[PDB]
Amino acid sequence: RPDFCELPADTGPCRVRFPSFYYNPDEKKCLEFIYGGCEGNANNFITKEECESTCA
Amino acid sequence: DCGKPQVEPKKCPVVGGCVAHPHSWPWQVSLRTRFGMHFCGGTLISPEWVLTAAHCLEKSPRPSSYKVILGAHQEVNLEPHVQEIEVSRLFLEPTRKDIALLKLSSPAVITDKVIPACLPSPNYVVADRTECFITGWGETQGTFGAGLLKEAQLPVIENKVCNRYEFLNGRVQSTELCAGHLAGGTDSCQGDSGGPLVCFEKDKYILQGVTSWGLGCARPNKPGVYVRVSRFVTWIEGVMRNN
């Protein structure tokens, strides 16, 4: 599990509503979050599987 | 007549704000996936054209992957009288700003629930503290109106003040305008992107901004940043007439 799996969910400054997934270390689960559309971090996945296969 | 709704809009003195009167913002568009989930706003500026933000079209350049919903009040339970039109063409603004044009696969029918908005003067600057309206089905953040068209009456904040360290600190460009209450609590949010920032000017509503970004939603001293439309009018005209 790469380092960025430990980074927090960054929606970003933009103000699109892209539902996405981030890995949650303290819960050891892939949870849903809104991505704003610009900037942010690698802890950002489009499927629940992509999060799990990468950071879980 | 564009910019003139046949249902008189509420004035409300989207996080915070109020649920709008149905069809009082007839130019409001819900941009969607083929699945049909709302992820962005849009603005009917003419029967075949919708103005939005470029970040909404990030993933795919396929125009057929985009769907335009017109005359809605509910984000999910669409009214029976609603218009669902596919996008024919996308036009990203060349200097890579957060503004884009969607050409509709078929022109929208202008009714009393679907009316377009008016374009501002080229290089026009909305004066500081001008009260404009923000509409959209974005996040509400624990505030009422989730799933319904929400509106907010926000004052324009001039960029010299908006770029003060206390606020956005040099983040805001010439081709952007700031808007909102500095005390926070009322603002556009994720899901409102591409949405209209309209200003009542002559005797009708005029599109002056496009919901772009902000440092968080509805936070104190953190006004929303909007694409300054008046800077792209000339570009918009030439796209509509040549395409």
Residue numbers in the entry:
A (entry chain C): 3 to 58
B (entry chain A): 547 to 559, 562 to 791
Extract from the study:
Textilinin-1, isolated from the venom of the Australian brown snake, Pseudonaja textilis, is an experimental drug (Q8008, Venomics Pty Ltd) and is suggested as a novel anti-bleeding agent to replace aprotinin. Textilinin-1 is a good inhibitor of plasmin but with a more narrow binding specificity compared to aprotinin. Kunitz-type inhibitors (similar in structure to aprotinin) are one class of small protein commonly found in such venoms. Herein, we describe a kinetic study of the inhibition of human plasmin and plasma kallikrein by textilinin-1 and aprotinin, and report the crystal structure of the complex between urokinase-activated microplasmin (protease domain of human plasmin) and textilinin-1.
